[PDB]
Symmetry: C2
Subunit: 210 residues, 2 copies
């Protein structure tokens, strides 16, 4: 049984992007609800004492939906920062190699998050076999982790993530999101994806959050 | 070449269920956008001069997403009424038969609409082979029509359909929706589903909603 993580920044620290109320609802209610739903669903089952990483990579159905949503949001929050941070030279190099330039990566990342139809998530994930960074869009609760890929960056595109401050204007929301990307954290994720592979995710969930 | 349908009621007629602003965005922007997207996507293609029913039942990809979303919303708007209207004796009989009672149908319909995960629609559709009314949930833009079934009632559960007035409280939104069901329209759909089958859908789209001028 898990507990909702603390937001890694103050609710009023990103006024050009999300408002305190947006956070109250997204984190305080939606995220909270996924935590409570998982706890209630695993009670008396094979996962009642399993780690989130365990449940995430092994479960399915509702248990998965909730487990994954808890992970996706936790990851999403860490991808955000009040103030801009710099990219590690390795991440920068990797992005320019796999995308041509940082500007092209942005363009590709945003366009992909713009066209994702219905509820979902838009990721930048490290492929272990290809050793390349891919821009992947997943629907509803899915996450690249179940495809053996390591999340480096993600933006929530479920409408509840931006309707309060932006209504239907997802593009504006995306542009504001990009400006607040916690490159420092994206850099960490990359470095460890290369060193521990999918194991870095395990560590993240268990040693960095839950 | 399509144009956004007129809302079948006043934007301020839906009490605490849907507010005028909610309508400005849902109909005025989301629905409007699917119309504009489809028009732009078919320009210069095989579907350029096709009817919505045609495109809806034959296309796929983005063309389908937009085509279906146009239909789904059109249908959704007609399922709403400033005040709940009456059920035809046939529809009532049919619902009691396939669900036990109206109250049980409500219970089942609402529960199915409540658990549908992610974006989607919650329908009550007539099965032509079984001649039974089924409660079906579809994801994103899908609609029973592609499974040869006739929509009788639907509720939009994409979050944009209720976030403005209800935020995350889909259940409250669903309970309010139910109180505004245009049974008169649901009855029409049923009668014609039995008489013209999937053809009633064709007529609905081409003849009474998107009649070119
Ligand atoms: Fe979310
Ligand atoms: Fe809608």
């Amino acid at each position: 049984m898990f507990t909702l993580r603390e937001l890694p920044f103050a609710k009023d620290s990103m006024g050009d992007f999300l408002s305190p109320v947006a956070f109250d609802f997204h984190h305080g209610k939606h995220h909270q609800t996924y935590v409570n739903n998982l706890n209630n669903l695993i009670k008396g089952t094979d996962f009642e004492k399993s780690s989130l990483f365990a449940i995430l990579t092994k479960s399915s159905g509702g248990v998965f939906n909730n487990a994954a949503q808890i992970y996706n949001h936790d990851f999403y929050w860490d991808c955000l920062s009040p103030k801009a941070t710099a990219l590690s030279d390795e991440l920068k190099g990797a992005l320019e190699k796999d995308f041509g330039s940082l500007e092209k990566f942005k363009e590709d990342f945003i366009k992909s998050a713009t066209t994702l139809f219905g509820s979902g998530w838009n990721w930048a994930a490290y492929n272990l076999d290809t050793q390349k960074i891919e821009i992947i869009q997943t629907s509803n609760a899915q996450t690249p982790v179940t495809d053996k890929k390591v999340p480096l960056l993600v933006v929530d595109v479920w409408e509840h993530a931006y309707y309060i401050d932006h209504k239907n204007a997802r593009p504006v929301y995306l542009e504001k999101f990009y400006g607040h990307i916690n490159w420092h954290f994206v850099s960490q994720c990359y470095e460890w994806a290369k060193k521990e592979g999918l194991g870095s995710v395990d560590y993240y969930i268990n040693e960095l959050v839950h």
